[PDB]
Amino acid sequence: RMEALIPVINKLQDVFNTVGADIIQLPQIVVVGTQSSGKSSVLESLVGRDLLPRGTGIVTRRPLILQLVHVSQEDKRKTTGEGVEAEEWGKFLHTKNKLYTDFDEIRQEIENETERNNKGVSPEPIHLKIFSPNVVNLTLVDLPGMTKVPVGDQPKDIELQIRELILRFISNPNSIILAVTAANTDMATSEALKISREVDPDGRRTLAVITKLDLMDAGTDAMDVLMGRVIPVKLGIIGVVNRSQLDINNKKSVTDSIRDEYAFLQKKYPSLANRNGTKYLARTLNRLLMHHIRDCLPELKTRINVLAAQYQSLLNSYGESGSGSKEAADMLKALQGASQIIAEI
Amino acid sequence: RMEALIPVINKLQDVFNTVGADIIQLPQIVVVGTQSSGKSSVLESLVGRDLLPRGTGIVTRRPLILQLVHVSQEDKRKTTGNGVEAEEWGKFLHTKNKLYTDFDEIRQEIENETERNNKGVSPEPIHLKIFSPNVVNLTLVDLPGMTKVPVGDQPKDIELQIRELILRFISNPNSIILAVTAANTDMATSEALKISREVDPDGRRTLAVITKLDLMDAGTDAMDVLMGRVIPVKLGIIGVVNRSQLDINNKKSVTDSIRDEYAFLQKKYPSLANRNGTKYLARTLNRLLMHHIRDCLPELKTRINVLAAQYQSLLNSYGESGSGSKEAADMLKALQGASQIIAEI
């Protein structure tokens, strides 16, 4: 079937990046949320294990394009450091074709690049492909979390740069914003939903994810929110119950968590349990991204053809080293690779 | 979707094999046809390139379990023995985890194992997994081709052994018979269809494939056959136009071949072109095998548990080396692996 489009857009995310993927306006999902929104837990429940750096320190302030590539369970490698085959592995773009079978080394490597003009915030994303038979085909551009208070309600000046970086990605007209908000907070005044209404006043291209449903105060529930009566978003409202830090320190598996999540949703939200949960979240994002890329593909393949022409006339106006011409030349070479990938189905 | 059943049965096809998979009655598609039925071309049009041994000699007289495993185009290997990422590769069960990037070396291995008590025909199948982004998830156990004339109409007595090998596989109640017949032959007296009516009088579990549609005599066509007015099979009759030996020697690609096949079907069979062709063949067989495995799965995992019980009582009757007890022990060990693989979805 011809909805195998996610790997093609993955290749486009790699062929640009350095030359600038912003002007291409690639169809992708931008993950926005605060730092106590369980944002890292929503991603690790899709991966199926620990991955993201779980110690704060002074790091984890950099975009992370997470590319989950589904494989069959008969597709295995040799463990890094030469038998015993590895069911899952990973590849960083900056390390080229180096293999990563130990997920502790993968998690270490994510933190090794987030720390390396950047005054604490760097716009350059980290490209990481996770090959696994337990994930669906899905790509998520993960952005640094905001503070749960507005910018003026906290001292650190660097927070303005964080919202600048977020607006840089969600200003993409072809980006789908996945806003993550906790249930034990005032979801009508969420920092994730608030900043999404800036580039998308209606809920046209925004899907809301409500986390930590079991951490709400006694006597209330998210029934009014999970039924589409509170948050004005139009791509859907999905509630999940991810792993807590206590579960991770107790080495609870994602498999055990999604099972206990289904039980929590059947007891508390029986009439809504089939449209919520981590399993439903991954299935919806896969279909949502596939349908979105297909709709934006004819626009994208014209966008590449128009941009290369205008960059060519930009080189001639430059005349006959030169940093402006070197920038245009590299961009023209990236568009040549982009046109080849689109041409190959 | 939880149609991850083709890799599961692929693992079962490997976990048995040595101990005997006949009594397990695995859900699989058995390809039957004559020497000149274009059966080998129907297999290479699904693989997408040359694969099967193309020199006769006196060999290729063994079953071939061909397991096409789809991969994403970002899933590549190192070439056996230049950088050069490998989009496709292969692994033989007898060579364990050895990699095969040169497809000429893969063809060589098929003939190295098909030649190695057997008096010209060996029931031991050759297990070969082909990982490729240009194939669909599909498994086809290919059996040695018969003679175009009946057994009594040719001198070699080994043909009786050939018919026995086919009847051994298609007598499986859970096997789907893929009958391959040429269009320039009398399909009412086809050697492939007639042996299929022995184990399957109606076309309950038989799909007919008509090849070489462009090789029919002037003034005739397969319109009466592709409309279900001739061959009494019930899973469907699909006609294809595969590469000839002239096209293979001229290094024609399968992409160009299916290009000419679609054009031929628009000219000669305009009202039926939509339900025929190689693309339709792979798409139909992929759904056909997936649905068949899902229908046979609840009974299959009951069979494994019952067989293990009956093999246990068989050991007890044996009492207190011994080839009969060793056979029962191996079957209990293989069924132990089968039960674990089935338990994991």
Curated annotation (Swiss-Prot), chain A:
<comment type="similarity">
    <text>Belongs to the TRAFAC class dynamin-like GTPase superfamily. Dynamin/Fzo/YdjA family.</text>
</comment>
<feature type="binding site">
    <location>
        <begin position="33"/>
        <end position="41"/>
    </location>
    <ligand>
        <name>GTP</name>
    </ligand>
</feature>
<dbReference type="InterPro" id="IPR020850">
    <property type="entry name" value="GED_dom"/>
</dbReference>
<feature type="binding site">
    <location>
        <begin position="211"/>
        <end position="217"/>
    </location>
    <ligand>
        <name>GTP</name>
    </ligand>
</feature>
<comment type="function">
    <text>Functions in mitochondrial and peroxisomal division. Mediates membrane fission through oligomerization into membrane-associated tubular structures that wrap around the scission site to constrict and sever the mitochondrial membrane through a GTP hydrolysis-dependent mechanism. The specific recruitment at scission sites is mediated by membrane receptors like MFF, MIEF1 and MIEF2 for mitochondrial membranes.</text>
</comment>
<dbReference type="InterPro" id="IPR001401">
    <property type="entry name" value="Dynamin_GTPase"/>
</dbReference>
<feature type="modified residue" description="N-acetylmethionine">
    <location>
        <position position="2"/>
    </location>
</feature>
<dbReference type="Pfam" id="PF00350">
    <property type="entry name" value="Dynamin_N"/>
</dbReference>
<dbReference type="InterPro" id="IPR019762">
    <property type="entry name" value="Dynamin_GTPase_CS"/>
</dbReference>
<dbReference type="InterPro" id="IPR030381">
    <property type="entry name" value="G_DYNAMIN_dom"/>
</dbReference>
<feature type="region of interest" description="G2 motif">
    <location>
        <begin position="59"/>
        <end position="61"/>
    </location>
</feature>
<comment type="subunit">
    <text>Homotetramer; dimerizes through the N-terminal GTP-middle region of one molecule binding to the GED domain of another DNM1L molecule. Oligomerizes in a GTP-dependent manner to form membrane-associated tubules with a spiral pattern. Interacts with GSK3B and MARCHF5. Interacts (via the GTPase and B domains) with UBE2I; the interaction promotes sumoylation of DNM1L, mainly in its B domain. Interacts with PPP3CA; the interaction dephosphorylates DNM1L and regulates its transition to mitochondria.</text>
</comment>
<dbReference type="Pfam" id="PF02212">
    <property type="entry name" value="GED"/>
</dbReference>
<dbReference type="InterPro" id="IPR022812">
    <property type="entry name" value="Dynamin"/>
</dbReference>
<dbReference type="InterPro" id="IPR045063">
    <property type="entry name" value="Dynamin_N"/>
</dbReference>
<feature type="region of interest" description="G1 motif">
    <location>
        <begin position="33"/>
        <end position="40"/>
    </location>
</feature>
<dbReference type="Pfam" id="PF01031">
    <property type="entry name" value="Dynamin_M"/>
</dbReference>
<feature type="region of interest" description="G5 motif">
    <location>
        <begin position="241"/>
        <end position="244"/>
    </location>
</feature>
<feature type="binding site">
    <location>
        <begin position="242"/>
        <end position="245"/>
    </location>
    <ligand>
        <name>GTP</name>
    </ligand>
</feature>
<feature type="domain" description="Dynamin-type G">
    <location>
        <begin position="23"/>
        <end position="298"/>
    </location>
</feature>
<dbReference type="InterPro" id="IPR000375">
    <property type="entry name" value="Dynamin_stalk"/>
</dbReference>
<dbReference type="InterPro" id="IPR003130">
    <property type="entry name" value="GED"/>
</dbReference>
Swiss-Prot record, chain B:
<protein>
    <recommendedName>
        <fullName>Dynamin-1-like protein</fullName>
    </recommendedName>
</protein>
<feature type="binding site">
    <location>
        <begin position="242"/>
        <end position="245"/>
    </location>
    <ligand>
        <name>GTP</name>
    </ligand>
</feature>
<comment type="subunit">
    <text>Homotetramer; dimerizes through the N-terminal GTP-middle region of one molecule binding to the GED domain of another DNM1L molecule. Oligomerizes in a GTP-dependent manner to form membrane-associated tubules with a spiral pattern. Interacts with GSK3B and MARCHF5. Interacts (via the GTPase and B domains) with UBE2I; the interaction promotes sumoylation of DNM1L, mainly in its B domain. Interacts with PPP3CA; the interaction dephosphorylates DNM1L and regulates its transition to mitochondria.</text>
</comment>
<dbReference type="InterPro" id="IPR045063">
    <property type="entry name" value="Dynamin_N"/>
</dbReference>
<dbReference type="InterPro" id="IPR003130">
    <property type="entry name" value="GED"/>
</dbReference>
<feature type="region of interest" description="G1 motif">
    <location>
        <begin position="33"/>
        <end position="40"/>
    </location>
</feature>
<dbReference type="InterPro" id="IPR022812">
    <property type="entry name" value="Dynamin"/>
</dbReference>
<dbReference type="Pfam" id="PF01031">
    <property type="entry name" value="Dynamin_M"/>
</dbReference>
<dbReference type="InterPro" id="IPR027417">
    <property type="entry name" value="P-loop_NTPase"/>
</dbReference>
<dbReference type="InterPro" id="IPR019762">
    <property type="entry name" value="Dynamin_GTPase_CS"/>
</dbReference>
<feature type="region of interest" description="G3 motif">
    <location>
        <begin position="142"/>
        <end position="145"/>
    </location>
</feature>
<dbReference type="InterPro" id="IPR030381">
    <property type="entry name" value="G_DYNAMIN_dom"/>
</dbReference>
<feature type="region of interest" description="G2 motif">
    <location>
        <begin position="59"/>
        <end position="61"/>
    </location>
</feature>
<dbReference type="Pfam" id="PF02212">
    <property type="entry name" value="GED"/>
</dbReference>
<feature type="modified residue" description="N-acetylmethionine">
    <location>
        <position position="2"/>
    </location>
</feature>
<dbReference type="Pfam" id="PF00350">
    <property type="entry name" value="Dynamin_N"/>
</dbReference>
<feature type="binding site">
    <location>
        <begin position="33"/>
        <end position="41"/>
    </location>
    <ligand>
        <name>GTP</name>
    </ligand>
</feature>
<feature type="region of interest" description="G5 motif">
    <location>
        <begin position="241"/>
        <end position="244"/>
    </location>
</feature>
<dbReference type="InterPro" id="IPR020850">
    <property type="entry name" value="GED_dom"/>
</dbReference>
<dbReference type="InterPro" id="IPR001401">
    <property type="entry name" value="Dynamin_GTPase"/>
</dbReference>
<feature type="region of interest" description="G4 motif">
    <location>
        <begin position="211"/>
        <end position="214"/>
    </location>
</feature>
<feature type="binding site">
    <location>
        <begin position="211"/>
        <end position="217"/>
    </location>
    <ligand>
        <name>GTP</name>
    </ligand>
</feature>
